[PDB]
Ligand binder design. Structure first.
Ligand SMILES: OC[C@H]1O[C@H](O[C@H]2[C@H](O)[C@@H](O)[C@@H](O)O[C@@H]2CO)[C@H](O)[C@@H](O)[C@@H]1O
Ligand SMILES: OC[C@H]1O[C@H](O[C@H]2[C@H](O)[C@@H](O)[C@@H](O)O[C@@H]2CO)[C@H](O)[C@@H](O)[C@@H]1O
Ligand SMILES: OC[C@H]1O[C@H](O[C@H]2[C@H](O)[C@@H](O)[C@@H](O)O[C@@H]2CO)[C@H](O)[C@@H](O)[C@@H]1O
Ligand SMILES: OC[C@H]1O[C@H](O[C@H]2[C@H](O)[C@@H](O)[C@@H](O)O[C@@H]2CO)[C@H](O)[C@@H](O)[C@@H]1O
Lengths: 16, 464, 471, 464, 471, 16
């Protein structure tokens, strides 16, 4: 839900 | 951490996973490499959760619509077949697994929904959705019903919503336009309004799911269902004298189902990429390979030229292709997850009466188009330009010019050599972050911003 | 969106774009691939606008100085020439298209301005800038003038500004110091002052531009001009018995033109990067290909070794390289753009009397002109983001829109000219008041500009500004 | 157009309208001026609709909370009693009819909700809301129920929502702060969550309305109801041995009902203002006048000192005052309409299960606080400042300076003597307007904006 | 929120605020009503900020010139004096508090600057401005100086600027022409030039202000000053044997001070308008009331006929009225504020050398200073509205806020100083970086300013700027 | 509903 959402952002944040 | 020296595969429970496991026993017999085929539930969600971390399966099977989303998150390895192997699958199945010029999965088969019907109860199935209400009234009097299908997944109701003009994303000038969603137009309203009325008028039940509808049809309790090729196998086993046919029309318009390509991608973090490549190329995408899976649950129109030639001769496969021609192939873009989630909610809320159609499809509109995010972005853009205006007004060749990055952080005009810090974003892509911590970006000695931004300190805010 | 299976090429209107299209024709003959050569106005500014969004040419051509900025922004593909191909071009030409240790374009030719003079009017051209006033007075007595060249582009005036000490960015430690700008030093002041004094004493006209100077030289009206190899072609066609020579000295010091390397870059967003590579490597960068372009407009001293060995023997190319040697290869740092802008403005303002030399070069030193434009620009950007914010707010959270009305809209956008085009229905012809101000020039705001919102909810490419006329 | 030479009065159906009409017959006997008392439904809404136009009743009766709203719209005439008449009503009833220093209606009586209970079924009523569930289980087994009251009007559920911290508008520094609404705090959630649970657990029915609850209680089918003084009369008539008492506590906290002052305002457009003034002052607000209405339906604590003295001796009136002391007097501000509408929707959606409590009270939050309007306003403010920034930058004592007016129109810097025109607003206070038409404002020769803005051309967009 | 059942009065620190509070004491004695007299800094600018939102004093006192602007904005109640009361004050004093045909304040007294000189140092004060330099040189030889007065307020310099032709707004047809501003004409130029020349020749110091001049005169250090009746009080206390006289001429022309009528206005938002009326009409506007204020700081020539008949016989008041007659009653149009601002800036910039006289008066002519401040101001306003827009968006439509956290917030606001204070929880001490720029003066942005968000979700009144120090 | 809302604005618009 919002845990998988946070996880998706964290990986985008890591790349950026 | 995936165990090196084995293959772990994920595929959905409705597909021929026992056929696949036999192909796995062929590989193991030949190479000595164990193949474990699993079918976890919520497969398409459970993958980016695990694969993100560097864990999960070596290979994943699902329709191509969700593969853009994995490629963007960088969870899929780039497959590398040559001319000689690509010449053996149909070109349009390759299009479905191409994200930004790169092939990211192997196409397996083309799935489309058809109207399946009981020939004994209904020798002549309705050509239009509009006559189904009356047809259900007759069947009720015989203690049966007209139509049951899965009302819990927007995939099955989409054909009706698209029929009179409903669409996901607009396709213009080469690209899909993620800001133009057609889930709230007159067509979508009319299709969804029609479904909702069938329910108010008790021709369908809003609780009806995949297993309820399958069992009812295969026991002979309902005259019609909506499903794909994977379902035919269970109907063969049952009594039922069934026909597979073109979907009914709505407002004189053909139903437009979304066409999916079943696909095998390879987990980026797995150390078994070549073993997996040898299993998919030399074992699965063979006639012997595809037949084994197909003789368990039909696949639809397969991606392999040498095997479809035969399969095309089946009238059920003809019907699958007829419906496919009337729908669109699904976009593979990352925004597909958000669209499907949006429409799933609309249909369920609309069906249950929790919301009207108008209310429901507008929420889906706003969600699918990420309009909250697009509004916030406009505000941040404006704010960032202003801060630059303020500075210039108060005022040389050595600055890093202001930017707004993908996360919404405005990096101000800065001095060459400065390590700049800015509060973490207050909101980003559905999630709120602790703004008491900062992100960090270096303005290099040469007056250009460092390419990478340190966002490591930005933590989400969750439960309690 | 760049069309797959063809090549669009952008080059400047002064270059040999017809020669290049013949090279395009040979590529088509062999490969079946249509090659389109275009030369839009202001292409160096226009390319970063369109490419930044994934549009524009497959290949762009310009002096190497603008490429550093394109590469920094992400607009160019990294090029993959092999060893044998690399040995085919002068190493110093590869240096000029190097950014962050990556090759970001193919070098084509080296360009430097020279003094071009009319042999019949002037058997012996002047060695010095200082003798030009007297020479003009001697020439006025004959119904002619001494010197005309483009005053609207700083490139043409830079040699004189640099002569006695002016510079862009100081070079040392192998690097450019962007904190050390030499556009307002004593040397730059003296050069521009000389230029401004020529105008006050009516030896030159402030309004003189590329085409006025070219026509005036090619018609035998002025004895000298300043221009590059590309200009020689139109002179041949004209009668004029002309020479090309070393630029005149200032205060004993050589004029120091900025040396450009004409280069070809590949758009990062091009789906035809491989066709592009094959075209540039196997067709253009050959004796035949360079020769075809050169025959149309001379290129200068070509990067291709085998063809340069033939061209090196032309006294005009010899002069080009002598002027090049006394000047400097331009930087390719991203700051070049702001620098050219500042000097463009300083030169124009000083020539017209709008500012004194001291005022103009100080504004150039402090980057004031670019900063003012960035100030107005961010105001327009902020206002247009707001209007977008409003439409979005209303569209998503306001009272239900009319179910009978249009579903498809072009959304609020800001055009390159400063107009914010409002949310509009598919099919609409949209009217907006002409800008109050564009590029240092004020317009009448009570006439209108026009733009179609197309059938599919996309803004048309063209915007009609034909009605906006200034004061 | 009201008929000159008569009095037309509007009062609500639950009040003593027959008593009032007899006072009307007293007036008519004395003066020869006919008095017609009517009780239209949706009285509090039907008034500003008619009175706006210059039509409707001469006099209106309702609680004071909606009178701010009429005064702002300029629909109430300013009443003019002297010292000698004001000294006869209690000062705090005068506070309730004062909007911006002006008295705008006559106070009649103080109403508060109490817990009414059947002494035979329940000799000892519960002191806490929390024991009501168990109490209903016992009563169900006897084929009765514990509690019925009107679930359709937020007035009756408010006492429970306010109990543990719920509030309408924050009262700080003299004024009510219309931007600080307390309909979505922990207290409001807890109170509303408690009500919703009673329904899920079938201790109440979400359909239950005023007439359902009244009839059930007066037939002896339910042990408790919640109502005001107007209701006692119907209970007297019925069998029921009733007690009137303090409301139950919630989380150990007293229930906080909103206290209303019944009030008589005078329609601004009526030509019978003095006749109406003579009827209210010399006929209604007398002991004979008030008694006549009261002996039909009780009024609660009346506003007249000479009659309350007696009335205060009634233990039922004591209880009404006890509950009143524990609640707040209602704000009379114009934003009251919007608050009540917001809370009505929340409670109904929450009760029916169409929305959860959290979802429901957040919508009410956003609605009650006019947050959409407040967000749009911030955008218009910002836009208007920018347009001024742009102009100043491009640039003497003769301009009209930029303003943003109450409707959201940004009047730019303009030349003295200019007739300026600007597009009508795209949205205003709930309604969309045709923006193809303009508003008009004159910048006077002296460099100040004209006081009045021509908005006559701005027409709404409605049906079809 | 103004407290009901009391009166707050604002008057300037230079006026007789203690005398006025004694009048307040008598009102309290009779009525039981507490009267509080305050004299905040910059009250004329501060009153429109606080009153505009329904806060501030019940009664404000200032020269009539600012009142037109207050009345235009809606900040003053219309006053209701009766016929008998109106006949009690000079008709020309009622004229000065008339705006749009409405009486908007009570006139108290007429004020004009005079020349004040030290009889012991200067038996015969100069008739002309031109003789002041020589007189200063004669006085320097004695360790004294000729002339010191406040250079920071244009009011004090205006008489000299107006002398030879300078004016605010041209008056004719019975009206002021706001398109006809006379602040950059030959007459205004000459007056300011004389003033600036006095500074270059070290007869005056640019930094001289009200308190430096007053102390220097009252201490016997300077032979002359320029000031109004309110200043006489502190001189009496000091030793100085002083006279008050007609201002010196410039180029033969009288100095033309702007005449002010000290006036008392009632706040439109005051719930005590009737108490206010009774105080001003029945207590202050009496022989006793005026006398009480006058004994503290002289008022000038009072509006009250019966008391003016006694005061008219003072040679200092005689001089006040002679200077008044050669000057002009100030306009009360709303544009006065922008005009004072422009002239304040022009005078200060010219005195310090920051601009030439021509530059400063031209900027004053074109209103450039006010316009620049309005430009920066709207940028700050726009940015802060945006931040508010963001908080609202997130608060209403974003993901659910934490159920455990605070419900009450102070919302995003812009303070009078330019800081945008962000949405903050009830109880929070909020830190913001000091402004980059305030009122023509730049500050250090890496120290902070402080403001409490109070217990109830309201911003505290006070904002702590004690840490913001300039360069 | 929205007709009474429009009517309320129209009267505010008339006054303003
Ligand atoms: O229900 C939305 C869902 O639709 C599609 O999933 C299909 C899938 O393509 C079929 O292979 C089959 O298994 O049924 C699924 C629906 O239950 C999309 O592929 C999927 O991403 C989306 O969530
Ligand atoms: O005028 C500034 C301008 O100078 C150079 O442009 C040259 C270009 O290099 C030549 O190829 C030829 O086209 O003339 C141009 C002058 O108009 C820089 O390359 C350019 O970036 C700069 O703006
Ligand atoms: O339900 C919201 C409603 O509450 C109040 O109305 C009361 C009124 O005060 C009583 O006299 C009695 O008639 O019951 C009404 C509730 O049905 C507010 O006065 C009203 O404005 C509001 O809409
Ligand atoms: O300096 C401009 C200023 O002049 C006047 O202020 C006077 C005021 O009238 C006197 O009462 C006394 O206090 O001295 C002040 C000068 O500081 C105008 O009344 C005022 O509006 C203007 O700003």
């Amino acid at each position: 839900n919002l845990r998988a959402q946070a996880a998706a952002n964290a990986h985008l944040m890591a790349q950026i | 951490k995936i165990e090196e020296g084995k293959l772990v595969i994920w595929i959905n429970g409705d597909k021929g996973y026992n056929g696949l496991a036999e192909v796995g026993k062929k590989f193991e017999k030949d190479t000595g490499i164990k193949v474990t085929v699993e079918h976890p539930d919520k497969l398409e969600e459970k993958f980016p959760q695990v694969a993100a971390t560097g864990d999960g399966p070596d290979i994943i099977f699902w329709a191509h619509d969700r593969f853009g989303g994995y490629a963007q998150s960088g969870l899929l390895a780039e497959i590398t077949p040559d001319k000689a192997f690509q010449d053996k699958l149909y070109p349009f199945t390759w299009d479905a697994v191409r994200y930004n010029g790169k092939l990211i999965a192997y196409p397996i088969a083309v799935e489309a929904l058809s109207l399946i019907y009981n020939k004994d109860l209904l020798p002549n199935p309705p050509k239009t959705w509009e006559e189904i209400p009356a047809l259900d009234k007759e069947l009720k009097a015989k203690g049966k019903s007209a139509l049951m299908f899965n009302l819990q997944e927007p995939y099955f109701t989409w054909p009706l919503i698209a029929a009179d003009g409903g669409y996901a994303f607009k396709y213009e000038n080469g690209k899909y336009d993620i800001k133009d969603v057609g889930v709230d137009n007159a067509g979508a309203k009319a299709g969804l309004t029609f479904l909702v009325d069938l329910i108010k008028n008790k021709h369908m039940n809003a609780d009806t799911d995949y297993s309820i509808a399958e069992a009812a049809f295969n026991k002979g309790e309902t005259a019609m269902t909506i499903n794909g090729p994977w379902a035919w196998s269970n109907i063969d086993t049952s009594k039922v004298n069934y026909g597979v046919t073109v979907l009914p029309t709505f407002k004189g318009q053909p139903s437009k189902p979304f066409v999916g390509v079943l696909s095998a991608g390879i987990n980026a973090a797995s150390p078994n990429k070549e073993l997996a490549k040898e299993f998919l190329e030399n074992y699965l995408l063979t006639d012997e390979g595809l037949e084994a899976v197909n003789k368990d649950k039909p696949l639809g129109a397969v991606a392999l030229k040498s095997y479809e030639e035969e399969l095309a001769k089946d009238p059920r496969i003809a019907a699958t292709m007829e419906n496919a021609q009337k729908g669109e192939i699904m976009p593979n873009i990352p925004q597909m997850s958000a669209f499907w989630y949006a429409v799933r909610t609309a249909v369920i809320n609309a069906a249950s009466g929790r919301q009207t159609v108008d209310e429901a499809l507008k929420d889906a509109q706003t969600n699918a188009a990420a309009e909250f995010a697009a509004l916030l972005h406009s505000l941040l853009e404006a704010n960032c330009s202003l801060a630059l205006a303020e500075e210039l007004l108060l005022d040389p060749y050595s600055y890093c010019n202001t930017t707004l990055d993908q996360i919404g952080t405005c990096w101000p005009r800065s001095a060459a050599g400065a390590l700049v810090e800015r509060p973490c974003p207050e909101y980003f892509n559905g999630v709120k972050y602790n703004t008491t911590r900062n992100a960090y970006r270096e303005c290099l000695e040469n007056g250009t911003w460092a390419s990478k931004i340190n966002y490591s300190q930005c933590e989400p805010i969750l439960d309690d």
